[PDB]
Design a protein around this ligand. Sequence first.
Ligand SMILES: CC1=C2C[C@H]3[C@@H](CC=C4C[C@@H](O)CC[C@@]43C)[C@@H]2CC[C@]12O[C@@H]1C[C@H](C)CN[C@H]1[C@H]2C
Ligand SMILES: CC1=C2C[C@H]3[C@@H](CC=C4C[C@@H](O)CC[C@@]43C)[C@@H]2CC[C@]12O[C@@H]1C[C@H](C)CN[C@H]1[C@H]2C
Length: 573
Amino acid sequence: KCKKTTTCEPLKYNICLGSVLPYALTSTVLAEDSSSQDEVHDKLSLWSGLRNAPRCWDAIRPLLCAVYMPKCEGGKVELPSQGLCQTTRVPCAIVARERGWPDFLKCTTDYFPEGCPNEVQNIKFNSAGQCEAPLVRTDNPKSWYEDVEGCGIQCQNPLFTNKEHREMHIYIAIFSSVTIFCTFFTLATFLVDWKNSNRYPAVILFYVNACFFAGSIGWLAQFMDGARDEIVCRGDGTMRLGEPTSSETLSCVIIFIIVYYSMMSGVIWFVMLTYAWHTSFKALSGKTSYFHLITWSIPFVLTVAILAVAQVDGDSVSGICFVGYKNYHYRAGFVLAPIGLVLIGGGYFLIRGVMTLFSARRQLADLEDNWETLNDNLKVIEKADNAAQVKDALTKMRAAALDAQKEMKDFRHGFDILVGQIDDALKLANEGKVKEAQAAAEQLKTTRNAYIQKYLERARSTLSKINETMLRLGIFGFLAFGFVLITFGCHFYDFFNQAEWERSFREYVLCEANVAIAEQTNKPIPECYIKNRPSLLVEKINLFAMFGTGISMSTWVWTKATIIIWKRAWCRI
Ligand SMILES: CC1=C2C[C@H]3[C@@H](CC=C4C[C@@H](O)CC[C@@]43C)[C@@H]2CC[C@]12O[C@@H]1C[C@H](C)CN[C@H]1[C@H]2C
Ligand SMILES: CC1=C2C[C@H]3[C@@H](CC=C4C[C@@H](O)CC[C@@]43C)[C@@H]2CC[C@]12O[C@@H]1C[C@H](C)CN[C@H]1[C@H]2C
């Protein structure tokens, strides 16, 4: 009979000599020189050396597959046919001459029964129609998926359909457009007033938006008539992976360089921003030429390193080329690490900045507290009947003014005068003279205005400036940290389940490989699908995060003080 009784075990390799196996279970019983599938793969590695003789190889492939890796299903293995074995004798006669034939490969009808249907005869090792979606026939051996011959891994992302591609593309369209013109607004502002806006750290924002403009450009590049497929796909319609490979158009690596470099410089400029703020608070342009070198060296070195390991991959959904898609331990290395370090540094100099801020914020408030005391005490003194209230309030005034006394010598002199006059009024009030002290408090009023009000209203305005700065730092801090937290979350999710998505994808590929033969042989065909895939909402979130940062830094230039600056250049008469 065409069937043999043995125990079916799973394939350790789902490929037979560059051809995908349409079945899932096999048996090592027919390979009489083998006992395990390791041995089988070894023997096939020995038979591999025959590939230098294509004339024989063509005819011996199917036999070798039907023998060493046969279909096992429900305790049965189908034995190869006599007709199949006879097609090996004539051309592979070389095997017979140099070392002879193995006894289990000799065409004795007990090993090869006559007229037996074989699953292998259906399989084509010249992949004319063998290549099955999500795979496409390419005859370039640099695009061949794993060990499969003639088949390449298709260009468009096989985890999301076109219905989702259009979606994400219009999403990225809108967002990146908002960013590309917001950053242009912010550039134009600091550019038209290049003479008056070129200061540090106000030019650091300009540099940030410059970077995030350059990047959004590369993000928009994929929307031209046929540019997307030029960036993402190879010449043979198979997605660009491990770029830059030899003899491929640099239409990918250029976009990668843009999107990555602009991004990284764009986030190191954050650290430079926080430092510049801190040192601005601590009091200059001595280190202003050294920030540059850092913010341009580090992204360069990183990008060059990525190009050195050649781990640029192409995504059709995003429509760009970026680091560490295929191998996700590179994305964590070149994206998550620099961003995290940026978060740490920028956060450090932020809190240092608000310490440098907090220390004065209390001082000015204390001065305001003393002035708050003086006025209300004068309010009580000027309008009182009992001469105990006058004594009391005068003492309190003395305490406050004394506490406030603790170009500068003039300021202290004023409070000398105030304390003195207050003590005079104290002497007057102690003796029970109510209205004499009350009248001697108007002296305190006019003196308060004359000698003290200057330095006070001088330091009255700063509490608005300082609080505004404090709250805008309150914006930037809890904004940037939120963005970093979110993008770290997304990247960590993908980082987490990319170990599973590849499993599911592979199983799916094998399934469709089964479907291929299952259809053109009038055999029952099983439905194939992806068990699990990346969430599109997560990618939505990440994009929203980075573009949201790109927009929020362009929002900074949005002031009413800016709007009028535009008029000066061309208002004329
Ligand atoms: C590759 C090769 C062969 C390896 C095959 C053998 C047929 C049977 C088996 C049994 C199986 O258990 C292990 C594999 C082995 C040995 C076949 C004969 C032809 C050739 O050996 C020649 C040696 C010669 C020096 C050069 N040319 C070499 C090749 C054409
Ligand atoms: C398709 C695919 C992927 C699409 C995913 C990517 C992780 C991150 C993103 C970013 C996100 O914005 C869009 C989706 C995208 C591009 C993931 C990497 C693994 C894989 O590429 C592998 C090639 C490999 C040879 C076989 N296995 C293939 C697939 C598991």
